[PDB]
Design a protein around this ligand. Structure first.
Ligand SMILES: *[C@@H]1O[C@H](CO)[C@@H](O[C@@H]2O[C@H](CO)[C@@H](O)[C@H](O)[C@H]2NC(C)=O)[C@H](O)[C@H]1NC(C)=O
Lengths: 7, 186, 180, 191, 187
């Protein structure tokens, strides 16, 4: 899975 | 206890499909789908070349594999990375080095994947005959190897090279050979 | 005082759109995936099985990194990486003897961003046959390193150069080797 | 890409299959192998390509000409491996051996002998040194295995570092199946 | 956009992500370090010894806070020391500790050079002797050099103006050999 930065 | 490898494989690009049979990691037959001919690796092996107890299994495997390349390919192309190794050449004599006596350089190519290659021999960086074919075979762990042979008579100033072209993208590998520790005279 | 380190390192770079996914044991590459070739490549044949197993989803990982880069670039107000020019060294695999086949190694170290042009020059001409090269390898300080190789047969006449280009360099670096 | 349809049979000198596999891989990734216990293709890959591994497994699981071809995997091997088998099973080429000096490396010792051993088959081989009849440890360690020449012959070597004395005679002692008696080769300090 | 000097001065932006498994004494102690780097500045990490994400720099503050709120994610990283680190160390041991290649040791004048090349792994010891007596003065080394191909090399120099009759010995201790290697040189 992809750990996405805060947006 | 021994092993008998029966390896059907196929790929994009030529050779599109092949089968390699090996006993204890030496090639017995490489199949020729052109004439449904099972070719032997040595002359001594020529006679069991036509056992067609194999044919239905071979035809199934051959086709199911080509299905995979043709039908799975389009799906995964660009979606997963393509497996690929840079081949490695080594060059050594068949017999111990003895100046003036007949000998044979062996170019052993390893870590070959995918199995598309061209081998070239040179003498002092000058192209030379090649003395026959390049035998590609399957090895355990889903990899390939290849051998090529150059007959020669070793002299003290010899320099030879083997150049291996991986045909997936024309990457080249090189291995030099020079006379060393030649055996003496009684 | 530690014994071993395994590192999974990924990067993505704009506006080049280059990227990598690799594994590393005590500084040595187990295998990589490139965005330029999209091949899974194991460093030695012994790592073949491991690499196939561990690289099947590497392209997605890089796509994830790309998306995170764009968020970070934006968040930083488009602050650009500062070019750091490489240190380059040329040495041989083993002690050199005449007519004794050897291997030139060019080490390109301590640089960023991970973009370089490396060419081997023999007597001032580029060598195309027999050259190998590593991809961009990670460092503790977050710069990169790279290796280029050329199997060769030492002689008194032949003279070699490793030419390196990088945006942190005012001009190309030429590292010379000759037989002495 | 490279797809693989690979079957291996683990035979015997006698000719008796002691095991059997049939496996499918794609892109060097092992996807699904035959299980002779439950008579079906079971997924081996549980990574990204797992989903694909179930799809191939089930396409094959519905073919009669296949599910029984492999149910009789063991006995089928013996059938194909019968005309040439026995023949290869006792194929041997004896090893030719020579001893000469070679350039010393990794040693203070002024002399290094090399025992060359070649042309043999099968690959398995045992080399030992004797100094005037009595055994002695070699320069070699770290598990050397014969190099395949790729034409059903193998080659190898062994070294012994020494300080030559006048009467001394050194012996290379090679043990291969290709010869009934252990091969001996001698060398004495001359000149 | 700014124009000067050499072709392609366009700005670059770089993102790196690193997972580092640090092993102590086999696998008895293991430390996972998950790092995010923008350009050259590491901004946020998960240090298995700390148990949660922590901003290194300002730019990482939003991420540490956001990722720590995912109580689910924390649980999985906290267990990664086993599922990822220890598990992957399992696989290999062609790459892990087991690998062993023996050095090629040679000695040649230049100042005497003791060349130790082609070995693995990188733990080695190289000593100089004059007539049986160890010489520690005047001994420098290029350092341990990684070739990038899973072998190391090093040059260890001894400064002397040799005298006739003298025997110099380089001695090498490495895991690949049970007893030390020695190579000599004389003039
Ligand atoms: C790597 O080499 C390439 C080509 O040798 C360089 O590319 C060119 O850059 C100039 C301006 O700097 C352009 O005018 C050309 O059109 C480019 N050529 C190509 C083929 O793209 C590139 O700049 C080099 N990279 C580095 C880091 O120096």
């Amino acid at each position: 899975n992809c750990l996405k930065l805060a947006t | 206890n021994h092993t008998f490898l029966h390896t059907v494989y196929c790929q994009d690009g030529s050779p599109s499909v092949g089968l390699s049979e090996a006993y204890d990691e030496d090639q017995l037959f490489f199949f020729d789908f052109s004439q449904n001919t099972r070719v032997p690796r040595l002359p001594e092996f020529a006679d069991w070349a036509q056992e067609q107890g194999d044919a239905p299994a071979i035809l199934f495997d051959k086709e199911f594999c080509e299905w995979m390349i043709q039908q799975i390919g389009p799906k995964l192309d660009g979606k997963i990375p393509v497996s690929r190794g840079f081949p490695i050449a080594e060059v050594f004599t068949l017999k111990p080095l003895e100046f003036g006596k007949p000998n044979t350089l062996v170019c052993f190519v390893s870590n070959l994947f995918p199995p598309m290659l061209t081998v070239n021999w040179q003498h002092h960086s000058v192209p030379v005959e090649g003395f026959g074919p390049t035998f590609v075979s399957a090895v355990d762990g889903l990899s390939f190897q290849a051998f090529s042979y150059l007959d020669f008579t070793p002299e003290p100033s010899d320099i030879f090279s083997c150049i291996v072209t991986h045909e997936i993208d024309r990457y080249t590998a090189i291995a030099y050979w020079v006379p060393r520790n030649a055996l003496p005279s009684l | 005082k530690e014994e071993h380190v395994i590192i999974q390192a990924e990067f993505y770079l704009n506006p080049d759109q280059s990227g990598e996914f690799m594994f590393d044991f005590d500084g040595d590459e187990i295998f990589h995936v490139d965005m330029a070739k999209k091949e899974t490549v194991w460093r030695l044949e012994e790592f073949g099985r491991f690499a196939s197993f561990e690289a099947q989803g590497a392209l997605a990982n890089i796509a994830c990194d790309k998306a995170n880069l764009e968020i970070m670039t934006k968040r930083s107000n488009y602050t650009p990486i500062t070019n750091v020019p490489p240190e380059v060294t040329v040495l041989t695999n083993s002690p050199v003897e005449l007519r004794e086949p050897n291997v030139l190694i060019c080490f390109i170290d301590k640089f960023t961003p991970p973009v370089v042009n490396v060419t081997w020059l023999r007597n001032g001409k580029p060598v195309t046959t027999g050259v190998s090269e590593t991809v961009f390898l990670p460092r503790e300080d977050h710069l990169f390193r790279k290796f280029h190789y050329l199997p060769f047969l030492p002689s008194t006449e032949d003279v070699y150069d490793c030419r390196v280009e990088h945006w942190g360099l005012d001009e190309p670096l030429l590292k010379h080797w000759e037989f002495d | 890409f490279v797809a693989h349809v690979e079957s291996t049979c683990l035979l015997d000198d006698a000719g008796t299959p002691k095991d059997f596999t049939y496996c499918i891989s794609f892109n060097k990734d092992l996807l699904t192998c035959w299980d002779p216990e439950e008579n079906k293709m079971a997924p081996s890959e549980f990574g990204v390509l797992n989903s694909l591994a179930n799809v191939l497994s089930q396409h094959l699981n519905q073919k009669d000409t296949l599910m029984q071809r492999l149910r009789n995997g063991l006995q089928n091997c013996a059938t194909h491996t019968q005309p040439f088998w026995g023949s290869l099973t006792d194929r041997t080429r004896p090893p030719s051996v020579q001893v000469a000096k070679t350039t010393p490396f990794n040693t203070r010792e002024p002399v290094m002998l090399a025992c060359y051993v070649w042309g043999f088959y099968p690959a398995e081989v045992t080399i030992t040194w004797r100094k005037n009849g009595k055994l002695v440890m070699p320069h070699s360690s770290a598990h050397k295995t014969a190099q395949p020449n790729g034409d059903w012959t193998y080659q190898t070597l062994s070294h012994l570092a020494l300080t030559p004395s006048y009467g001394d005679t050194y012996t290379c002692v090679v043990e291969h199946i290709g010869a009934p008696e252990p091969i001996l080769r001698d060398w004495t300090p001359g000149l | 956009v700014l124009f000067q000097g050499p072709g392609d001065t366009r700005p670059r932006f770089l993102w790196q992500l690193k997972f580092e498994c640090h092993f102590f004494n086999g696998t008895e102690r293991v430390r996972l370090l998950e790092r995010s780097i923008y350009n050259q500045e590491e901004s946020v990490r998960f240090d298995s010894d700390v148990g949660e994400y922590r901003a290194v720099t300002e730019l990482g503050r939003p991420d540490a806070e956001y990722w720590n709120s995912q109580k689910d994610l924390l649980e999985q990283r906290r267990a990664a020391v086993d599922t990822y680190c220890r598990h992957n160390y399992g696989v290999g041991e062609s790459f892990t500790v087991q690998r062993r290649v023996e050095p090629k040791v040679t000695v040649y004048p230049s100042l005497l050079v003791c060349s130790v090349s082609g070995f693995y792994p990188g733990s080695i010891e190289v000593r100089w002797f004059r007539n049986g007596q160890e010489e520690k003065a005047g001994v420098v080394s290029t350092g341990l050099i990684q070739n990038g191909d899973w072998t190391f090399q090093t040059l260890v120099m001894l400064e002397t103006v040799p005298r006739s009759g003298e025997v110099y010995t380089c001695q090498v201790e490495h895991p690949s050999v049970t007893s030390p290697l020695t190579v000599e040189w004389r003039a």
